[PDB]
Ligand binder design. Structure first.
Ligand SMILES: CN1C(=O)C(=O)c2ccccc21
Ligand SMILES: O=C(O)CNC(=O)C(=O)O
Ligand code: NI
Ligand SMILES: [Zn+2]
Length: 329
C-alpha cells in the first residue's frame, strides 16, 4: 500500500497535468496522498489565480467573527461573537494594528510555539464563510468557482438527481484566527487556495485513525459528548499537538503559503491557524471514492450543527434512516 505511514504529500503538477482536475486528484490518491487526510499542491509556475489583488479592499465582511476562547492552552473551545460589518480594507488595517498583528518571531516553529502558548488569551477576528470567489473567470485550471458539482457527481455515479448548489467561500484571517477540529460536511473533500498574505498552519489526523481523535475528544469534552453523538460537527473544539502527542493520536502538520493549494480528503480531521492577515478560498467537492464516506458520515444529534440547503439532499439520499430520525426529532 502506498504511503503507509500516512505522511502529508506535496505535489508539483506540470501545466499539462494541471488541466484535468479529477484526473490529478485520482493520481494523488494512486500515490497514497489521501492516507494523510491532507495534501499540498504547488501549482505550475506558469499558472495564476488572477492578475493582481490590488482591488479587493471593497469586498464586505458582513459578519466578522470574534473568536473567544474558553479553557486551557492545550484544550479549549472557541465561540464566535458577531461584530459589525467591515470592508476587507478595514479588516486588513485591523489585522495589522498593534492589538492584532503577528508578534516578532524567528521562524514558523517559533510562531507555532507562541500560538499554542498564548492563543486563549486573545480574541482574533475572522472573516469566514463569505460566499464568493477571487479566481479570474479566464483562469481555466483549478478555478474553485468552476469545479464539477457534488450534485453532478452523485448523478453520474448513482443516477441520483437532486436539488442544491455548490459555490466557494472566502476567508479573511489574521494572527491567531483558528479553525477548530473537524471533517467536512458529509465527510466531503475540501480544496483550499491561499490567495494572498501570511501562512496558514494545518494539523491533520489520517482518516484511518479518525475515531482515535473522536475518542480523545469525548474524554476531553465529556459534557459535550453527553449532549451530542458527534459534537465535533459543532466545530468549536481545539486540542494542541502537545496534547495529541501525549495521548498517542496520530497526526501531521504542515504550513501552507500564499499561492498554494491544500486538499483535505474524506474523513480527514483537520484544524489550524493563520499567521497574520491573509485571504483563502475554499470549496467542498466529491469523487466516486467519497460516496462510501458520505453514506456513513456521523452527524450531529442535538441540532446545534448547521446544515446547508445542499447538505439536506445529501443526507436524504445517502442516509435515509438518519434523515428520517432527524426530521421527526
Ligand atoms: C444537525 N442534525 C441533527 O440534529 C440530526 O439528527 C441530523 C442528522 C443528519 C444530519 C444532520 C443532523
Ligand atoms: O481556512 C479555514 O479557516 C478553514 N478551512 C478548511 O477547513 C478547509 O479548507 O477545509
Ligand atoms: Ni475544513
Ligand atoms: Zn450536536
Amino acid at each position: 500500500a502506498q504511503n503507509p505511514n500516512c505522511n502529508i504529500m506535496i505535489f508539483h503538477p506540470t501545466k499539462e497535468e494541471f488541466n484535468d482536475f479529477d484526473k490529478y486528484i485520482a493520481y494523488m490518491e494512486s500515490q497514497g496522498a489521501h492516507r494523510a487526510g491532507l495534501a499540498k499542491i504547488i501549482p505550475p509556475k506558469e499558472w495564476k489565480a488572477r492578475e493582481t489583488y490590488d482591488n479587493i479592499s471593497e469586498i464586505l465582511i458582513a459578519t466578522p467573527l470574534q473568536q473567544v476562547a474558553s479553557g486551557r492552552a492545550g484544550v479549549f473551545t472557541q465561540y464566535h461573537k458577531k461584530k459589525k460589518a467591515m470592508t476587507v480594507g478595514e479588516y486588513r488595517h485591523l489585522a495589522n494594528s498593534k492589538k492584532y498583528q503577528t508578534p516578532p518571531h524567528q521562524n514558523f516553529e517559533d510562531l507555532e510555539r507562541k500560538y499554542w502558548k498564548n492563543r486563549i488569551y486573545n480574541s482574533p477576528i475572522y472573516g469566514a464563510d463569505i460566499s464568493g470567489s477571487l479566481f479570474d473567470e479566464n483562469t481555466k485550471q483549478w478555478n474553485l468557482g468552476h469545479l464539477g458539482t457534488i450534485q453532478d457527481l452523485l448523478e453520474k455515479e448513482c443516477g441520483v438527481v437532486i436539488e442544491g448548489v455548490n459555490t466557494p467561500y472566502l476567508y479573511f484571517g489574521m494572527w491567531k484566527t483558528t479553525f477548530a477540529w473537524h471533517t467536512e460536511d458529509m465527510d466531503l473533500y475540501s480544496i483550499n487556495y491561499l490567495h494572498l498574505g501570511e501562512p496558514k498552519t494545518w494539523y491533520v489526523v489520517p482518516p484511518e485513525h479518525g475515531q482515535r481523535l473522536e475518542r480523545l475528544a469525548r474524554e476531553l469534552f465529556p459534557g459535550s459528548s453527553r449532549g451530542c453523538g458527534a459534537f465535533l460537527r459543532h466545530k468549536v473544539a481545539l486540542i494542541s499537538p502537545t496534547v495529541l502527542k501525549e495521548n498517542g493520536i496520530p497526526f501531521n502538520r504542515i504550513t501552507q503559503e500564499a499561492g498554494e493549494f491544500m486538499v483535505t480528503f474524506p474523513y480527514g480531521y483537520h484544524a489550524g491557524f493563520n499567521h497574520g492577515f491573509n485571504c483563502a478560498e475554499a470549496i467542498n467537492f466529491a469523487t466516486p471514492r467519497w460516496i462510501d464516506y458520505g453514506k456513513m458520515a456521523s452527524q450531529c444529534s442535538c441540532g446545534e450543527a448547521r446544515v446547508t440547503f445542499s447538505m439536506d439532499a445529501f443526507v436524504r439520499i445517502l442516509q435515509p434512516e438518519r434523515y428520517d430520525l432527524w426530521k421527526r426529532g
